[PDB]
Every structure is written in C-alpha cells, then in structure tokens.
C-alpha cells in the first residue's frame, strides 16, 4: 500500500537517535496480533491510537513539528481510505488494541519520556503498523 509505505517513511524520518544506543532497553508491549475485510474497524482503531499517541504534548516535545504534521496528514488520509471501504466481537478487538496503547502510554510515563524510551516506542510502532496494515 502506498499510504502505508508513506506513513512508515515519515515515522522513519522522525527518528532522532539509533536504537543501537538502547539495545539493553528492548521491551515487549504485547501487540495483540490475535486481533488482526472484518478487520477494517480494528485497523481504524490502530491508526486513531497512533494519531493519539503522537499528538500529545509529550510527542510534540520529542519529535520535529514539521515531520509530525506530515505524519498526521498521512494518518488522516489512511483513516479516510478505511472509512471509504458481530458488534460485540468488534468491541472486544478494539478494547484489546486500546490496552496495547495503554501499555505504551504507561511505559513512556515510567521512563520519563527519555530519548531511548521514545525510540523504543517509535520502533515498536514501525513494527506493529507494518503488521496491522499487512505491508
């Protein structure tokens, strides 16, 4: 997908430090792969949560503003593209994705938004976004 590749390209451009400087900080966030046509509202939640995570005051302090704005534009386009194409099962899938973002939120707060903690999270989202969009 061109949109997916562009989203990843912008998240790669946002990188400030190398994860090679943070290899002892490897952390498993338990991305619920078990939840991923029926996966469209689940992928929608995933993109909305990436937008939420990178739109906080903490994210604005950590990453370049011009690159973040380009990133939001691409996430907006992805959300729009998904809207163009059992309710309780869908709710359950959405709740599992939300718990994964809750672990990321707690981790950044616990690590006091350090450069390594933000690079661990950025690399985590490069991986889970690639998986969720089956790129």
């Amino acid at each position: 997908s061109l949109g997916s590749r562009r989203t990843l390209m912008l998240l790669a451009q946002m990188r400030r430090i190398s994860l090679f400087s943070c290899l002892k900080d490897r952390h498993d966030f338990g991305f619920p792969q078990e939840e991923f046509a029926e996966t469209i509202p689940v992928l929608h939640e995933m993109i909305q949560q990436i937008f939420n995570l990178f739109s906080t005051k903490d994210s604005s302090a950590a990453w370049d503003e011009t690159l973040l704005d380009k990133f939001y534009t691409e996430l907006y386009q992805q959300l729009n593209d998904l809207e163009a194409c059992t309710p309780l099962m869908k709710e359950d899938s959405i709740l599992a994705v939300r718990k994964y973002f809750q672990r990321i939120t707690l981790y950044l707060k616990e690590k006091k938004y350090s450069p390594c903690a933000w690079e661990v999270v950025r690399a985590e989202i490069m991986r889970s976004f690639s998986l969720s969009t089956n790129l």
């Epitope: 966030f29 338990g30 078990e34 059992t86 309780l88 359950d92 709740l95 599992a96 718990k99």
Partner: single-chain antibody, 232 residues
Framework: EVQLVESGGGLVQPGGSLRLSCAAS????????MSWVRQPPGKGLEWVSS????????YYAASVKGRFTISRDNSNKTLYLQMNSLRAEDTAIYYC???????????????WGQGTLVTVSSASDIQMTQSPSSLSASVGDRVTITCRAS??????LNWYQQKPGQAPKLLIY???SLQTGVPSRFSGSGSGTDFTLTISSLQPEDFATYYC?????????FGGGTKVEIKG
C-alpha cells in the same frame, strides 16, 4: 453465589481427544473473558488459554497452540477446552477462571473453578522469578515473598493463594489492591520489575503456596510459587 463447575476430566490415551467443560452461574458470563489454567502433578500453575467475552478472540500458550481450542456458549454460560493430540505433558488438573474484563491482559483471575483431572497415560519472553521457593514461619511472624519480572510490567502483577488439593484464590490484584473479603494482614507493593506480597502476622489458615502472576501481556505467566510451611 458465583460458581464455575468443571467436568470432562478423564483418563485418555496419547493422541486421542477430550473436551473439558466449565459451567458458569451467578455472574454475567457474556461480559467476561475466561481462561483455562493447568497444574501438572506437584508443579506450579501454567496459563493455557483465554477467550474474550464475545468469543471472537482467543489466545494460547505456545505449548498448546494448534492442538487445543478454547470456545464458549454464551447462551448456555459454558466455557470449553477441546484438547487434541494429547501428550503426557498435558496430564494436569485443569482450572477455568473468570477474568475481570471483557478482553485479556491488564486484568486478574477470580473466581476459579474446582478443577478437573486429565490423565494421559503412556516460552514467554517475560520471566517471573519468585523468591524464596519455600519458607518456614511461626504463627505471628511477618512473611515477605518477592516476585521479579525480567522487564517492566507496570502494576499488572496479581497474587494468588493455593492450599494443597484446592483451587487458587485471588488475594491481591494490580500489585496492591486487596481482594474483597481477604484479611487486611495481606498487602502487596511494587511497580515495574519488583513486587512484594507481605503477610503482617501469619495465621494457621495462611500455610499455603503463593503465586505471583503477570497480566501485562500474553502469554500470561505465573511465578514458580512459594510454599509457606511450619517452623520447628
């Protein structure tokens, strides 16, 4: 009033198949994720599988993936475990447990069923290290049990008490919250990687095995257990 009644346990030959049942009552079954947890003879607790409230999402321990299938019947309030390609490794008491949320992780197990025996005759990247493996104590002693996780699990660490021959019972959930009805002498503390369960003044009804359990991510994992025994 809340009950989980298990049945289906039996003596099965290797390779054959068997279905375990867990009949629920006294609670809204369809609003909760449910798990199976097993305990091989003389060994600790091992999480097997979880199924979300609506039955659409299932999670499995690496050792049973592809061989076991968890399912549920929300209208009949029954949880099932289909066990195929059965091995001696599968010989264990199987417990079903209600999860506190609609979907697994960041949650706890309460209550637990009575267990069902399965006898078959002839893996997590988060390690939970529980210390000590056993301790002797007198009535009135302060008892300290520690649990260390190989990475941060935030506050998602639960503690269970298991008397021999009985099902486990939740004592502390989310590192420090005391379960309703559990005496105030039990307390939990910690966050990140280091957690402690403290019994301020040990009573005779407290001699049991205690287990920590991370609920941060799947596979859900338990510590190796701590036996609290008498002192000479």
């Amino acid at each position: 009033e809340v009950q989980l009644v298990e049945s289906g346990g039996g003596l099965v030959q290797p390779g054959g198949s068997l279905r375990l049942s867990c009949a629920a009552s006294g609670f809204t079954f369809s609003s909760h994720a449910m798990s199976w947890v097993r305990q091989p003879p003389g060994k600790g607790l091992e999480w097997v599988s979880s199924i979300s409230a609506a039955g659409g999402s299932t999670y499995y321990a690496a050792s049973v993936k592809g061989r076991f299938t968890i399912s549920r019947d929300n209208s009949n309030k029954t949880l099932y475990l289909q066990m195929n390609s059965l091995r001696a490794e599968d010989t264990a008491i199987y417990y079903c447990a209600k999860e506190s949320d609609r979907v697994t992780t960041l949650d706890w197990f309460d209550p637990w069923g009575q267990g069902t025996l399965v006898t078959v005759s002839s893996a997590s990247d988060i390690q939970m290290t529980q210390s000590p493996s056993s301790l002797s104590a007198s009535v009135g002693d302060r008892v300290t049990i520690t649990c260390r996780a190989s990475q941060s699990i935030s506050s998602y660490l639960n503690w269970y008490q298991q008397k021999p021959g009985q099902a486990p019972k939740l004592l502390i959930y989310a590192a420090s919250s005391l379960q309703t009805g559990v005496p105030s002498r039990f307390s939990g503390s910690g966050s990140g990687t280091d957690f402690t369960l403290t019994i301020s003044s040990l009573q005779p009804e407290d001699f049991a095995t205690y287990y920590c359990q991370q609920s941060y991510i799947t596979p859900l994992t338990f510590g190796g257990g701590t036996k609290v025994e008498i002192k000479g």
